[PDB]
Amino acid sequence: LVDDKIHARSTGPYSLVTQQPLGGKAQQGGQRFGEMEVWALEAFGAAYTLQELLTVKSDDMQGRNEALNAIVKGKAIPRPGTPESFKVLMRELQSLGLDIAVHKVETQADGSSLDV
Amino acid sequence: LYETISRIKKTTKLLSQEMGRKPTEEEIATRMEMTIEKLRFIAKSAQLPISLETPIGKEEDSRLGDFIESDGETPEDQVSKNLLREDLEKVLDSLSPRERDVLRLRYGLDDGRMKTLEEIGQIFNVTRERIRQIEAKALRKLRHPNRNSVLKEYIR
Amino acid sequence: LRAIFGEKARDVRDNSLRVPNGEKGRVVDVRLFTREQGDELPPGANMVV
Amino acid sequence: QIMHRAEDLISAASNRYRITVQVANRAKRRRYEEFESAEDAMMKPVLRAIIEMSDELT
Amino acid sequence: VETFERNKTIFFPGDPAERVYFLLKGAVKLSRVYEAGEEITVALLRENSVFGVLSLLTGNKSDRFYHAVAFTPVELLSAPIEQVEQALKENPELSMLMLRGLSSRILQTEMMIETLAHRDMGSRLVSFLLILCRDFGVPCADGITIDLKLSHQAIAEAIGSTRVTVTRLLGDLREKKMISIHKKKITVHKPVTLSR
Amino acid sequence: VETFERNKTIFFPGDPAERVYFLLKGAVKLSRVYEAGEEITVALLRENSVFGVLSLLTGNKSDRFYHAVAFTPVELLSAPIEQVEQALKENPELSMLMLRGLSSRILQTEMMIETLAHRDMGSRLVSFLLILCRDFGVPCADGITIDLKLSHQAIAEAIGSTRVTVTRLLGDLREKKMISIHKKKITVHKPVTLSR
Amino acid sequence: TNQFDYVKIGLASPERIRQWGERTLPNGQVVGEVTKPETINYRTLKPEMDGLFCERIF
Structure with a gap:
């Protein structure tokens, strides 16, 4: 019956490990945007949404919040950061005989660093 | 404890013999030497954890643990709070800006709970008879309706 | 914010059980379960309702 | 009308992206600047932005 | 049988749980609030008895407009507004009961009246000092004293004092003959007699 | 509709007489009375409205220890003790009239009490002066004044000064530029605003 | 970005690898390594002090 399938989530509980909202059917879940779904976004024109959708409504943790806020404030929202599950992937990989140097190349002396 | 547990199991089975399904517990404690409180503790104590991802059940669709969250908190709380901050801030920060400093010094509004009036008295300008006076003064000031009646709703 | 109200706040989360949303309807029953009420519960639970 | 304007807007302008974004940021300013001036609850800063870019600007 | 500690409040202004209460024991003095500051207590009670007329002033829309106080470790009961609303709506006696208790808080005022805002900060301090000994006093040998563990400047709320409580009272304590102290005690010697 | 000469009395202790004294007009004060050489005039009233708290204090058997006063040319109605007895004994409505009244005066004390409780010959008045124009005031141009001739010490009874305060009343007109005076006219300029 | x-x-x-967990401290003596395979304690639940959940190294 209809009620058997109705849902909504402004926001709610997240995941454990991977903080992205806890989508399972009973309890404030969230719509998963698989590749083929993103294949309908980047296939379209202006795809910010994409971006953000990928993050602030799922992962930049702090990103999440303070967005939220930022609307409550009454203005726009701030630029995102990097989602989580990246950072996670680092970890694994690193945990497996790696030397990941995600890293910038700045200065006129072009500067090679690394990061968190 | 492993042994104690087993020993209990056997001893309780003896009770079960006379009192089927050993419903006796505290009576079993006459032979268990301890309130069921520990007996039940033992029960849970002797539990083996679960894969966090046994595929759920009634459907092989998913593992477990994928319906909970980490030690983190939802923005909904985060924000509310942070409101508090400023809400306050201004609302305090509209009576005796200097004293307002000590309001954050001898208290929070930053990262001390505290700077013991002692240390604080001199911290701002070296003082002994100008502190708990302006302290209460500050509170009672931002207290009472119109003043405290601003956190009256945001009691966070 | 205590101090201001100097509310010596309480200490107790309060996980009542609430009807979630989108339900109605009379209540038929209850079935309490504790040491006396069958005690059908996980090891260390007190009441089940 | 705004609809036809929205059309004309991008029926004779730069990359349909290129536009938008500049529609966007504009409104961003239209919101940042004139922050909550006329309520705007109805004429969203974006809407403004569009009309003032699809008719005023045109 | 609600209650608190020697350093607390019962409530504020603005706070709409204004129904007649029932100080079961202890004073639980109420400190009527003010704008910038300075709070009388005025109110001060006994066994069983009520305080905080709220759903009663501007109807049930009254704002306490007077912060409260858990003066000593409280002890205070209350009752569903109905008791002073529906249950009161009934026979007068019912309302009268609350009115009699209100008359107590009222009598209290009259008691402060004259004794308070008298003129001198010494006579006045005593004008209700003996009164105090008649309220939470402790009779013992010397005579009807209080004994409650107290300031020098809560006292000042008695006058608008600064050191009078610790200085002038010392007089009555010895130079003048009227009370004595045990670290923070009061031994009213007397109803009148010496020091009168 | 009883009344008495200006600045007379409605009774003395020992003679509660007809318990009630529904003070109608004039707008009239009860001076209290007691050993204290001073006898604060606490009660002060309006149209229609009551006094009479006699055949009730301490469950009756209570004299009106507050020697009364026919303050301005009075105007006061009353009603036999029994009249209220049976009345209140019956439905409360006929006397909800009467408990709303009570409130009027019960609260009439606490306020001005917040003023008198201000131990000082200054602000205490600036606050009290407002209350006046807020009750028997006369708004006119300057603003909400009283217009009732002020007997100087009439305002020194709630303070305790002698004549310094009497030239402080001048302040109101001069430095305070907050009232004026015209064969004892009384011209509160303002709710606050030539001297807040 | x-x-x-x-x-x-x-x-x-x-x-x-050993540079993934040194957490050398000011006592000056290095850590990050885990000397225990077990997890949280049985009595309390706290993370041993050198097991899979040692805090002082995570």
Whole structure:
């Protein structure tokens, strides 16, 4: 019956490990945007949404919040950061005989660093 | 404890013999030497954890643990709070800006709970008879309706 | 914010059980379960309702 | 009308992206600047932005 | 049988749980609030008895407009507004009961009246000092004293004092003959007699 | 509709007489009375409205220890003790009239009490002066004044000064530029605003 | 976005591996290593002090 399938989530509980909202059917879940779904976004024109959708409504943790806020404030929202599950992937990989140097190349002396 | 547990199991089975399904517990404690409180503790104590991802059940669709969250908190709380901050801030920060400093010094509004009036008295300008006076003064000031009646709703 | 109200706040989360949303309807029953009420519960639970 | 304007807007302008974004940021300013001036609850800063870019600007 | 500690409040202004209460024991003095500051207590009670007329002033829309106080470790009961609303709506006696208790808080005022805002900060301090000994006093040998563990400047709320409580009272304590102290005690010697 | 000469009395202790004294007009004060050489005039009233708290204090058997006063040319109605007895004994409505009244005066004390409780010959008045124009005031141009001739010490009874305060009343007109005076006219300029 | 440009896939030499958990302290003596395979304690639940959940190294 209809009620058997109705849902909504402004926001709610997240995941454990991977903080992205806890989508399972009973309890404030969230719509998963698989590749083929993103294949309908980047296939379209202006795809910010994409971006953000990928993050602030799922992962930049702090990103999440303070967005939220930022609307409550009454203005726009701030630029995102990097989602989580990246950072996670680092970890694994690193945990497996790696030397990941995600890293910038700045200065006129072009500067090679690394990061968190 | 492993042994104690087993020993209990056997001893309780003896009770079960006379009192089927050993419903006796505290009576079993006459032979268990301890309130069921520990007996039940033992029960849970002797539990083996679960894969966090046994595929759920009634459907092989998913593992477990994928319906909970980490030690983190939802923005909904985060924000509310942070409101508090400023809400306050201004609302305090509209009576005796200097004293307002000590309001954050001898208290929070930053990262001390505290700077013991002692240390604080001199911290701002070296003082002994100008502190708990302006302290209460500050509170009672931002207290009472119109003043405290601003956190009256945001009691966070 | 205590101090201001100097509310010596309480200490107790309060996980009542609430009807979630989108339900109605009379209540038929209850079935309490504790040491006396069958005690059908996980090891260390007190009441089940 | 705004609809036809929205059309004309991008029926004779730069990359349909290129536009938008500049529609966007504009409104961003239209919101940042004139922050909550006329309520705007109805004429969203974006809407403004569009009309003032699809008719005023045109 | 609600209650608190020697350093607390019962409530504020603005706070709409204004129904007649029932100080079961202890004073639980109420400190009527003010704008910038300075709070009388005025109110001060006994066994069983009520305080905080709220759903009663501007109807049930009254704002306490007077912060409260858990003066000593409280002890205070209350009752569903109905008791002073529906249950009161009934026979007068019912309302009268609350009115009699209100008359107590009222009598209290009259008691402060004259004794308070008298003129001198010494006579006045005593004008209700003996009164105090008649309220939470402790009779013992010397005579009807209080004994409650107290300031020098809560006292000042008695006058608008600064050191009078610790200085002038010392007089009555010895130079003048009227009370004595045990670290923070009061031994009213007397109803009148010496020091009168 | 009883009344008495200006600045007379409605009774003395020992003679509660007809318990009630529904003070109608004039707008009239009860001076209290007691050993204290001073006898604060606490009660002060309006149209229609009551006094009479006699055949009730301490469950009756209570004299009106507050020697009364026919303050301005009075105007006061009353009603036999029994009249209220049976009345209140019956439905409360006929006397909800009467408990709303009570409130009027019960609260009439606490306020001005917040003023008198201000131990000082200054602000205490600036606050009290407002209350006046807020009750028997006369708004006119300057603003909400009283217009009732002020007997100087009439305002020194709630303070305790002698004549310094009497030239402080001048302040109101001069430095305070907050009232004026015209064969004892009384011209509160303002709710606050030539001297807040 | 402006934190880095390219990634550097590769291997973790034993120094780099041991360079994943040193957390040397001011007592001056290194850690990050775990000397226990067990997890939280049975009585309380706290993380041993050198097991899979040792705090002082995570």
